[PDB]
Amino acid sequence: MGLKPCDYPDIKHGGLYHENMRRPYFPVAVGKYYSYYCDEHFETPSGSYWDHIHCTQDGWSPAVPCLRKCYFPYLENGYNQNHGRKFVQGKSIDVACHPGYALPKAQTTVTCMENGWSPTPRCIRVKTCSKSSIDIENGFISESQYTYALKEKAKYQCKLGYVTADGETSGSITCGKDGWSAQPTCI
Ligand SMILES: O=S(=O)(O)OC[C@H]1O[C@@](COS(=O)(=O)O)(O[C@H]2O[C@H](COS(=O)(=O)O)[C@@H](OS(=O)(=O)O)[C@H](OS(=O)(=O)O)[C@H]2OS(=O)(=O)O)[C@@H](OS(=O)(=O)O)[C@@H]1OS(=O)(=O)O
Ligand SMILES: [Cl-]
Ligand SMILES: [Cl-]
């Protein structure tokens, strides 16, 4: 009999051409296909603004007729190589931020979703702790960098004969939003 029919395709971010003619012939028998378009900022799986939606035994095909088209923005606090390039939904792109700057928070790639880039492509200044801020007696900071990023550690070694609070000959402190995890002590 009938391996029966399909209903009016609810195209998200698009629509059917000749909408006034097609409605309703629906339900529509399988095999029947319709030309359709995608809205601005969106594209068909062919990479064009228009295509055809086929009524299959398992529904309408493509299942996602309209895919988002992401434009890569300018990164003021990062290195630019893709500014102006377009990417189809589901694509991941590497993001190189300047030293001291990161993505939020803190991925290394930005992915194109139906709702746009995820997360937003922008390099934000990272919170830091200063070494000039550390204070250790009977030991020294054996690293040795000036700026430490959140969650980054500062290594320290004790002087010959002195031990830390573990009590090992060396340890480390952590940089958090509130400053350093603590003071290094070598007794
Ligand atoms: O990432 S952003 O928020 O900065 O938006 C970047 C996109 O801005 C567009 C429009 O995006 S859309 O509204 O979502 O489609 O144009 C806007 O930014 C461009 C410059 O791109 S840049 O990366 O910021 O330099 C402006 O051009 S210009 O002013 O720099 O020459 C547009 O001004 S204008 O409309 O062209 O007059 C500005 O429009 S608006 O003020 O944002 O309304 C896209 O550029 S576009 O596609 O040429 O229009 C940007 O997408 S892109 O992939 O980063 O270029
Ligand atoms: Cl940025
Ligand atoms: Cl010291």
Side-chain angles (χ1 to χ4, degrees), residues 97-120:
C97 296
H98 283 174
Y101 285 84
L103 270 174
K105 263 164 209 202
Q107 274 108 337
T108 166
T109 53
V110 58
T111 302
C112 184
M113 315 284 175
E114 156 187 1
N115 294 13
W117 286 115
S118 165
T120 296

mmCIF file with all atom_site columns, all heavy atoms in Angstrom, residues 97-120:
data_model
loop_
_atom_site.group_PDB
_atom_site.id
_atom_site.type_symbol
_atom_site.label_atom_id
_atom_site.label_alt_id
_atom_site.label_comp_id
_atom_site.label_asym_id
_atom_site.label_entity_id
_atom_site.label_seq_id
_atom_site.pdbx_PDB_ins_code
_atom_site.Cartn_x
_atom_site.Cartn_y
_atom_site.Cartn_z
_atom_site.occupancy
_atom_site.B_iso_or_equiv
_atom_site.pdbx_formal_charge
_atom_site.auth_seq_id
_atom_site.auth_comp_id
_atom_site.auth_asym_id
_atom_site.auth_atom_id
_atom_site.pdbx_PDB_model_num
ATOM 1   N N   . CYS A 1 97  ? 46.624 33.154 21.077 1.00 0.00 ? 97  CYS A N   1
ATOM 2   C CA  . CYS A 1 97  ? 46.571 34.438 21.764 1.00 0.00 ? 97  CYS A CA  1
ATOM 3   C C   . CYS A 1 97  ? 47.982 34.915 22.095 1.00 0.00 ? 97  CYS A C   1
ATOM 4   O O   . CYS A 1 97  ? 48.927 34.125 22.151 1.00 0.00 ? 97  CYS A O   1
ATOM 5   C CB  . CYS A 1 97  ? 45.734 34.342 23.046 1.00 0.00 ? 97  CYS A CB  1
ATOM 6   S SG  . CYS A 1 97  ? 43.976 33.953 22.806 1.00 0.00 ? 97  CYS A SG  1
ATOM 7   N N   . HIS A 1 98  ? 48.123 36.212 22.310 1.00 0.00 ? 98  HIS A N   1
ATOM 8   C CA  . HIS A 1 98  ? 49.410 36.772 22.655 1.00 0.00 ? 98  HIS A CA  1
ATOM 9   C C   . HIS A 1 98  ? 49.793 36.266 24.032 1.00 0.00 ? 98  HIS A C   1
ATOM 10  O O   . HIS A 1 98  ? 48.935 35.813 24.796 1.00 0.00 ? 98  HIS A O   1
ATOM 11  C CB  . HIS A 1 98  ? 49.336 38.296 22.665 1.00 0.00 ? 98  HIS A CB  1
ATOM 12  C CG  . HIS A 1 98  ? 49.345 38.900 21.301 1.00 0.00 ? 98  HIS A CG  1
ATOM 13  N ND1 . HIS A 1 98  ? 49.155 40.255 21.083 1.00 0.00 ? 98  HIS A ND1 1
ATOM 14  C CD2 . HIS A 1 98  ? 49.531 38.356 20.078 1.00 0.00 ? 98  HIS A CD2 1
ATOM 15  C CE1 . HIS A 1 98  ? 49.221 40.503 19.792 1.00 0.00 ? 98  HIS A CE1 1
ATOM 16  N NE2 . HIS A 1 98  ? 49.450 39.365 19.155 1.00 0.00 ? 98  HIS A NE2 1
ATOM 17  N N   . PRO A 1 99  ? 51.090 36.319 24.368 1.00 0.00 ? 99  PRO A N   1
ATOM 18  C CA  . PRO A 1 99  ? 51.457 35.847 25.702 1.00 0.00 ? 99  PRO A CA  1
ATOM 19  C C   . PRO A 1 99  ? 50.765 36.688 26.772 1.00 0.00 ? 99  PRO A C   1
ATOM 20  O O   . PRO A 1 99  ? 50.748 37.910 26.692 1.00 0.00 ? 99  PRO A O   1
ATOM 21  C CB  . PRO A 1 99  ? 52.963 36.073 25.741 1.00 0.00 ? 99  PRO A CB  1
ATOM 22  C CG  . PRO A 1 99  ? 53.386 35.892 24.322 1.00 0.00 ? 99  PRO A CG  1
ATOM 23  C CD  . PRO A 1 99  ? 52.263 36.428 23.479 1.00 0.00 ? 99  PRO A CD  1
ATOM 24  N N   . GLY A 1 100 ? 50.188 36.022 27.764 1.00 0.00 ? 100 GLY A N   1
ATOM 25  C CA  . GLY A 1 100 ? 49.478 36.692 28.838 1.00 0.00 ? 100 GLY A CA  1
ATOM 26  C C   . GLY A 1 100 ? 47.993 36.785 28.543 1.00 0.00 ? 100 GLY A C   1
ATOM 27  O O   . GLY A 1 100 ? 47.222 37.260 29.362 1.00 0.00 ? 100 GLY A O   1
ATOM 28  N N   . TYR A 1 101 ? 47.598 36.323 27.359 1.00 0.00 ? 101 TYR A N   1
ATOM 29  C CA  . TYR A 1 101 ? 46.202 36.358 26.941 1.00 0.00 ? 101 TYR A CA  1
ATOM 30  C C   . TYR A 1 101 ? 45.693 34.971 26.598 1.00 0.00 ? 101 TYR A C   1
ATOM 31  O O   . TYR A 1 101 ? 46.416 34.154 26.046 1.00 0.00 ? 101 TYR A O   1
ATOM 32  C CB  . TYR A 1 101 ? 46.027 37.291 25.743 1.00 0.00 ? 101 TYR A CB  1
ATOM 33  C CG  . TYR A 1 101 ? 46.092 38.748 26.109 1.00 0.00 ? 101 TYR A CG  1
ATOM 34  C CD1 . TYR A 1 101 ? 47.312 39.401 26.220 1.00 0.00 ? 101 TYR A CD1 1
ATOM 35  C CD2 . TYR A 1 101 ? 44.940 39.465 26.380 1.00 0.00 ? 101 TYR A CD2 1
ATOM 36  C CE1 . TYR A 1 101 ? 47.379 40.742 26.568 1.00 0.00 ? 101 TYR A CE1 1
ATOM 37  C CE2 . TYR A 1 101 ? 44.995 40.803 26.728 1.00 0.00 ? 101 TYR A CE2 1
ATOM 38  C CZ  . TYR A 1 101 ? 46.217 41.434 26.823 1.00 0.00 ? 101 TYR A CZ  1
ATOM 39  O OH  . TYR A 1 101 ? 46.274 42.764 27.174 1.00 0.00 ? 101 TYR A OH  1
ATOM 40  N N   . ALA A 1 102 ? 44.438 34.708 26.924 1.00 0.00 ? 102 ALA A N   1
ATOM 41  C CA  . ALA A 1 102 ? 43.856 33.407 26.651 1.00 0.00 ? 102 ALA A CA  1
ATOM 42  C C   . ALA A 1 102 ? 42.406 33.493 26.223 1.00 0.00 ? 102 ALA A C   1
ATOM 43  O O   . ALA A 1 102 ? 41.778 34.555 26.281 1.00 0.00 ? 102 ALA A O   1
ATOM 44  C CB  . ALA A 1 102 ? 43.996 32.496 27.862 1.00 0.00 ? 102 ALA A CB  1
ATOM 45  N N   . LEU A 1 103 ? 41.876 32.364 25.790 1.00 0.00 ? 103 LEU A N   1
ATOM 46  C CA  . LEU A 1 103 ? 40.495 32.290 25.395 1.00 0.00 ? 103 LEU A CA  1
ATOM 47  C C   . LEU A 1 103 ? 39.713 32.028 26.650 1.00 0.00 ? 103 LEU A C   1
ATOM 48  O O   . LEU A 1 103 ? 40.273 31.651 27.675 1.00 0.00 ? 103 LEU A O   1
ATOM 49  C CB  . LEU A 1 103 ? 40.283 31.138 24.417 1.00 0.00 ? 103 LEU A CB  1
ATOM 50  C CG  . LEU A 1 103 ? 40.447 31.470 22.939 1.00 0.00 ? 103 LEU A CG  1
ATOM 51  C CD1 . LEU A 1 103 ? 40.352 30.197 22.107 1.00 0.00 ? 103 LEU A CD1 1
ATOM 52  C CD2 . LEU A 1 103 ? 39.405 32.480 22.503 1.00 0.00 ? 103 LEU A CD2 1
ATOM 53  N N   . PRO A 1 104 ? 38.400 32.213 26.593 1.00 0.00 ? 104 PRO A N   1
ATOM 54  C CA  . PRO A 1 104 ? 37.623 31.935 27.802 1.00 0.00 ? 104 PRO A CA  1
ATOM 55  C C   . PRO A 1 104 ? 36.997 30.540 27.741 1.00 0.00 ? 104 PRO A C   1
ATOM 56  O O   . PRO A 1 104 ? 36.176 30.268 26.866 1.00 0.00 ? 104 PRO A O   1
ATOM 57  C CB  . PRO A 1 104 ? 36.536 33.019 27.784 1.00 0.00 ? 104 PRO A CB  1
ATOM 58  C CG  . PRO A 1 104 ? 36.529 33.591 26.383 1.00 0.00 ? 104 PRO A CG  1
ATOM 59  C CD  . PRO A 1 104 ? 37.655 33.005 25.599 1.00 0.00 ? 104 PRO A CD  1
ATOM 60  N N   . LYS A 1 105 ? 37.395 29.646 28.648 1.00 0.00 ? 105 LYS A N   1
ATOM 61  C CA  . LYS A 1 105 ? 38.370 29.926 29.703 1.00 0.00 ? 105 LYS A CA  1
ATOM 62  C C   . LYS A 1 105 ? 38.814 28.576 30.285 1.00 0.00 ? 105 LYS A C   1
ATOM 63  O O   . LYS A 1 105 ? 38.164 28.045 31.182 1.00 0.00 ? 105 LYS A O   1
ATOM 64  C CB  . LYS A 1 105 ? 37.719 30.757 30.829 1.00 0.00 ? 105 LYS A CB  1
ATOM 65  C CG  . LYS A 1 105 ? 37.963 32.264 30.750 1.00 0.00 ? 105 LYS A CG  1
ATOM 66  C CD  . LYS A 1 105 ? 36.977 33.043 31.640 1.00 0.00 ? 105 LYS A CD  1
ATOM 67  C CE  . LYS A 1 105 ? 36.698 34.439 31.072 1.00 0.00 ? 105 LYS A CE  1
ATOM 68  N NZ  . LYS A 1 105 ? 36.196 35.401 32.102 1.00 0.00 ? 105 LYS A NZ  1
ATOM 69  N N   . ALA A 1 106 ? 39.897 28.014 29.759 1.00 0.00 ? 106 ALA A N   1
ATOM 70  C CA  . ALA A 1 106 ? 40.653 28.645 28.695 1.00 0.00 ? 106 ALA A CA  1
ATOM 71  C C   . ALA A 1 106 ? 40.936 27.656 27.573 1.00 0.00 ? 106 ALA A C   1
ATOM 72  O O   . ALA A 1 106 ? 42.037 27.107 27.480 1.00 0.00 ? 106 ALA A O   1
ATOM 73  C CB  . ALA A 1 106 ? 41.954 29.215 29.238 1.00 0.00 ? 106 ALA A CB  1
ATOM 74  N N   . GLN A 1 107 ? 39.944 27.440 26.713 1.00 0.00 ? 107 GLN A N   1
ATOM 75  C CA  . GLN A 1 107 ? 40.101 26.533 25.587 1.00 0.00 ? 107 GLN A CA  1
ATOM 76  C C   . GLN A 1 107 ? 41.249 27.013 24.708 1.00 0.00 ? 107 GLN A C   1
ATOM 77  O O   . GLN A 1 107 ? 41.882 28.027 24.992 1.00 0.00 ? 107 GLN A O   1
ATOM 78  C CB  . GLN A 1 107 ? 38.811 26.476 24.766 1.00 0.00 ? 107 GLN A CB  1
ATOM 79  C CG  . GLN A 1 107 ? 37.787 25.476 25.275 1.00 0.00 ? 107 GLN A CG  1
ATOM 80  C CD  . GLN A 1 107 ? 36.595 26.149 25.928 1.00 0.00 ? 107 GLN A CD  1
ATOM 81  O OE1 . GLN A 1 107 ? 36.687 27.289 26.395 1.00 0.00 ? 107 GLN A OE1 1
ATOM 82  N NE2 . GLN A 1 107 ? 35.467 25.446 25.967 1.00 0.00 ? 107 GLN A NE2 1
ATOM 83  N N   . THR A 1 108 ? 41.513 26.283 23.638 1.00 0.00 ? 108 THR A N   1
ATOM 84  C CA  . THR A 1 108 ? 42.570 26.654 22.722 1.00 0.00 ? 108 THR A CA  1
ATOM 85  C C   . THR A 1 108 ? 41.983 26.717 21.333 1.00 0.00 ? 108 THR A C   1
ATOM 86  O O   . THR A 1 108 ? 42.628 27.178 20.392 1.00 0.00 ? 108 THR A O   1
ATOM 87  C CB  . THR A 1 108 ? 43.731 25.662 22.775 1.00 0.00 ? 108 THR A CB  1
ATOM 88  O OG1 . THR A 1 108 ? 44.590 25.872 21.646 1.00 0.00 ? 108 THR A OG1 1
ATOM 89  C CG2 . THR A 1 108 ? 43.205 24.233 22.747 1.00 0.00 ? 108 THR A CG2 1
ATOM 90  N N   . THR A 1 109 ? 40.753 26.232 21.210 1.00 0.00 ? 109 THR A N   1
ATOM 91  C CA  . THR A 1 109 ? 40.061 26.234 19.939 1.00 0.00 ? 109 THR A CA  1
ATOM 92  C C   . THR A 1 109 ? 38.660 26.785 20.091 1.00 0.00 ? 109 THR A C   1
ATOM 93  O O   . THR A 1 109 ? 38.068 26.736 21.173 1.00 0.00 ? 109 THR A O   1
ATOM 94  C CB  . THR A 1 109 ? 40.055 24.840 19.275 1.00 0.00 ? 109 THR A CB  1
ATOM 95  O OG1 . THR A 1 109 ? 39.538 23.870 20.193 1.00 0.00 ? 109 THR A OG1 1
ATOM 96  C CG2 . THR A 1 109 ? 41.469 24.436 18.849 1.00 0.00 ? 109 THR A CG2 1
ATOM 97  N N   . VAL A 1 110 ? 38.148 27.335 18.999 1.00 0.00 ? 110 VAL A N   1
ATOM 98  C CA  . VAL A 1 110 ? 36.810 27.895 18.951 1.00 0.00 ? 110 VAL A CA  1
ATOM 99  C C   . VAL A 1 110 ? 36.010 27.057 17.945 1.00 0.00 ? 110 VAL A C   1
ATOM 100 O O   . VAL A 1 110 ? 36.483 26.787 16.837 1.00 0.00 ? 110 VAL A O   1
ATOM 101 C CB  . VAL A 1 110 ? 36.860 29.395 18.557 1.00 0.00 ? 110 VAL A CB  1
ATOM 102 C CG1 . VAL A 1 110 ? 37.559 29.576 17.209 1.00 0.00 ? 110 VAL A CG1 1
ATOM 103 C CG2 . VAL A 1 110 ? 35.476 29.996 18.531 1.00 0.00 ? 110 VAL A CG2 1
ATOM 104 N N   . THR A 1 111 ? 34.831 26.595 18.349 1.00 0.00 ? 111 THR A N   1
ATOM 105 C CA  . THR A 1 111 ? 33.999 25.759 17.474 1.00 0.00 ? 111 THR A CA  1
ATOM 106 C C   . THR A 1 111 ? 32.751 26.489 16.953 1.00 0.00 ? 111 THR A C   1
ATOM 107 O O   . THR A 1 111 ? 32.154 27.302 17.656 1.00 0.00 ? 111 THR A O   1
ATOM 108 C CB  . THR A 1 111 ? 33.622 24.415 18.150 1.00 0.00 ? 111 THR A CB  1
ATOM 109 O OG1 . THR A 1 111 ? 34.815 23.698 18.511 1.00 0.00 ? 111 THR A OG1 1
ATOM 110 C CG2 . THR A 1 111 ? 32.796 23.561 17.198 1.00 0.00 ? 111 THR A CG2 1
ATOM 111 N N   . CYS A 1 112 ? 32.360 26.184 15.718 1.00 0.00 ? 112 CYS A N   1
ATOM 112 C CA  . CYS A 1 112 ? 31.186 26.807 15.115 1.00 0.00 ? 112 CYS A CA  1
ATOM 113 C C   . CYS A 1 112 ? 29.940 26.016 15.445 1.00 0.00 ? 112 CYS A C   1
ATOM 114 O O   . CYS A 1 112 ? 29.809 24.851 15.053 1.00 0.00 ? 112 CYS A O   1
ATOM 115 C CB  . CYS A 1 112 ? 31.349 26.932 13.589 1.00 0.00 ? 112 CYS A CB  1
ATOM 116 S SG  . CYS A 1 112 ? 29.981 27.824 12.711 1.00 0.00 ? 112 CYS A SG  1
ATOM 117 N N   . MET A 1 113 ? 29.029 26.645 16.176 1.00 0.00 ? 113 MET A N   1
ATOM 118 C CA  . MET A 1 113 ? 27.773 26.014 16.550 1.00 0.00 ? 113 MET A CA  1
ATOM 119 C C   . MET A 1 113 ? 26.636 26.702 15.809 1.00 0.00 ? 113 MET A C   1
ATOM 120 O O   . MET A 1 113 ? 26.828 27.751 15.200 1.00 0.00 ? 113 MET A O   1
ATOM 121 C CB  . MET A 1 113 ? 27.508 26.113 18.052 1.00 0.00 ? 113 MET A CB  1
ATOM 122 C CG  . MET A 1 113 ? 28.655 25.795 18.984 1.00 0.00 ? 113 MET A CG  1
ATOM 123 S SD  . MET A 1 113 ? 29.037 23.903 19.182 1.00 0.00 ? 113 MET A SD  1
ATOM 124 C CE  . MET A 1 113 ? 30.595 24.034 20.272 1.00 0.00 ? 113 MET A CE  1
ATOM 125 N N   . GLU A 1 114 ? 25.451 26.116 15.875 1.00 0.00 ? 114 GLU A N   1
ATOM 126 C CA  . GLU A 1 114 ? 24.283 26.684 15.221 1.00 0.00 ? 114 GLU A CA  1
ATOM 127 C C   . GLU A 1 114 ? 24.019 28.098 15.734 1.00 0.00 ? 114 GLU A C   1
ATOM 128 O O   . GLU A 1 114 ? 23.466 28.941 15.019 1.00 0.00 ? 114 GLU A O   1
ATOM 129 C CB  . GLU A 1 114 ? 23.062 25.803 15.478 1.00 0.00 ? 114 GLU A CB  1
ATOM 130 C CG  . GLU A 1 114 ? 21.730 26.524 15.359 1.00 0.00 ? 114 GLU A CG  1
ATOM 131 C CD  . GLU A 1 114 ? 20.560 25.656 15.791 1.00 0.00 ? 114 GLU A CD  1
ATOM 132 O OE1 . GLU A 1 114 ? 20.797 24.497 16.201 1.00 0.00 ? 114 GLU A OE1 1
ATOM 133 O OE2 . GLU A 1 114 ? 19.405 26.130 15.720 1.00 0.00 ? 114 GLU A OE2 1
ATOM 134 N N   . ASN A 1 115 ? 24.428 28.351 16.977 1.00 0.00 ? 115 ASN A N   1
ATOM 135 C CA  . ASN A 1 115 ? 24.224 29.649 17.624 1.00 0.00 ? 115 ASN A CA  1
ATOM 136 C C   . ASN A 1 115 ? 25.409 30.606 17.441 1.00 0.00 ? 115 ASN A C   1
ATOM 137 O O   . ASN A 1 115 ? 25.377 31.734 17.932 1.00 0.00 ? 115 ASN A O   1
ATOM 138 C CB  . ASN A 1 115 ? 23.949 29.454 19.121 1.00 0.00 ? 115 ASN A CB  1
ATOM 139 C CG  . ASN A 1 115 ? 22.627 28.737 19.392 1.00 0.00 ? 115 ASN A CG  1
ATOM 140 O OD1 . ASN A 1 115 ? 22.015 28.167 18.486 1.00 0.00 ? 115 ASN A OD1 1
ATOM 141 N ND2 . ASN A 1 115 ? 22.185 28.767 20.648 1.00 0.00 ? 115 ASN A ND2 1
ATOM 142 N N   . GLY A 1 116 ? 26.450 30.150 16.743 1.00 0.00 ? 116 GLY A N   1
ATOM 143 C CA  . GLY A 1 116 ? 27.651 30.944 16.502 1.00 0.00 ? 116 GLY A CA  1
ATOM 144 C C   . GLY A 1 116 ? 28.896 30.285 17.079 1.00 0.00 ? 116 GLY A C   1
ATOM 145 O O   . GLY A 1 116 ? 28.862 29.103 17.433 1.00 0.00 ? 116 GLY A O   1
ATOM 146 N N   . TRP A 1 117 ? 29.992 31.043 17.179 1.00 0.00 ? 117 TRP A N   1
ATOM 147 C CA  . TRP A 1 117 ? 31.257 30.514 17.726 1.00 0.00 ? 117 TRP A CA  1
ATOM 148 C C   . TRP A 1 117 ? 31.114 30.186 19.200 1.00 0.00 ? 117 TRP A C   1
ATOM 149 O O   . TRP A 1 117 ? 30.482 30.928 19.951 1.00 0.00 ? 117 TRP A O   1
ATOM 150 C CB  . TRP A 1 117 ? 32.396 31.535 17.583 1.00 0.00 ? 117 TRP A CB  1
ATOM 151 C CG  . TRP A 1 117 ? 32.913 31.704 16.212 1.00 0.00 ? 117 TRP A CG  1
ATOM 152 C CD1 . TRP A 1 117 ? 32.844 32.837 15.445 1.00 0.00 ? 117 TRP A CD1 1
ATOM 153 C CD2 . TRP A 1 117 ? 33.643 30.750 15.408 1.00 0.00 ? 117 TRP A CD2 1
ATOM 154 N NE1 . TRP A 1 117 ? 33.437 32.623 14.229 1.00 0.00 ? 117 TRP A NE1 1
ATOM 155 C CE2 . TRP A 1 117 ? 33.928 31.349 14.192 1.00 0.00 ? 117 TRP A CE2 1
ATOM 156 C CE3 . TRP A 1 117 ? 34.021 29.413 15.650 1.00 0.00 ? 117 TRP A CE3 1
ATOM 157 C CZ2 . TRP A 1 117 ? 34.609 30.677 13.174 1.00 0.00 ? 117 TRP A CZ2 1
ATOM 158 C CZ3 . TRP A 1 117 ? 34.699 28.750 14.621 1.00 0.00 ? 117 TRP A CZ3 1
ATOM 159 C CH2 . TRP A 1 117 ? 34.990 29.382 13.411 1.00 0.00 ? 117 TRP A CH2 1
ATOM 160 N N   . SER A 1 118 ? 31.760 29.104 19.617 1.00 0.00 ? 118 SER A N   1
ATOM 161 C CA  . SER A 1 118 ? 31.735 28.669 21.008 1.00 0.00 ? 118 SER A CA  1
ATOM 162 C C   . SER A 1 118 ? 33.136 28.226 21.466 1.00 0.00 ? 118 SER A C   1
ATOM 163 O O   . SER A 1 118 ? 33.647 27.195 21.022 1.00 0.00 ? 118 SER A O   1
ATOM 164 C CB  . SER A 1 118 ? 30.734 27.518 21.180 1.00 0.00 ? 118 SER A CB  1
ATOM 165 O OG  . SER A 1 118 ? 30.925 26.846 22.409 1.00 0.00 ? 118 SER A OG  1
ATOM 166 N N   . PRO A 1 119 ? 33.761 29.000 22.377 1.00 0.00 ? 119 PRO A N   1
ATOM 167 C CA  . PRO A 1 119 ? 33.177 30.244 22.876 1.00 0.00 ? 119 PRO A CA  1
ATOM 168 C C   . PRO A 1 119 ? 33.430 31.332 21.865 1.00 0.00 ? 119 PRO A C   1
ATOM 169 O O   . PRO A 1 119 ? 33.815 31.056 20.727 1.00 0.00 ? 119 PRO A O   1
ATOM 170 C CB  . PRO A 1 119 ? 34.004 30.528 24.130 1.00 0.00 ? 119 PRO A CB  1
ATOM 171 C CG  . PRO A 1 119 ? 35.320 29.928 23.839 1.00 0.00 ? 119 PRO A CG  1
ATOM 172 C CD  . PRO A 1 119 ? 35.013 28.669 23.079 1.00 0.00 ? 119 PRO A CD  1
ATOM 173 N N   . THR A 1 120 ? 33.249 32.575 22.279 1.00 0.00 ? 120 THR A N   1
ATOM 174 C CA  . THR A 1 120 ? 33.491 33.691 21.389 1.00 0.00 ? 120 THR A CA  1
ATOM 175 C C   . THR A 1 120 ? 34.981 33.815 21.131 1.00 0.00 ? 120 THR A C   1
ATOM 176 O O   . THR A 1 120 ? 35.798 33.613 22.032 1.00 0.00 ? 120 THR A O   1
ATOM 177 C CB  . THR A 1 120 ? 32.886 34.983 21.931 1.00 0.00 ? 120 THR A CB  1
ATOM 178 O OG1 . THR A 1 120 ? 31.458 34.847 21.982 1.00 0.00 ? 120 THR A OG1 1
ATOM 179 C CG2 . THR A 1 120 ? 33.251 36.159 21.035 1.00 0.00 ? 120 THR A CG2 1
#
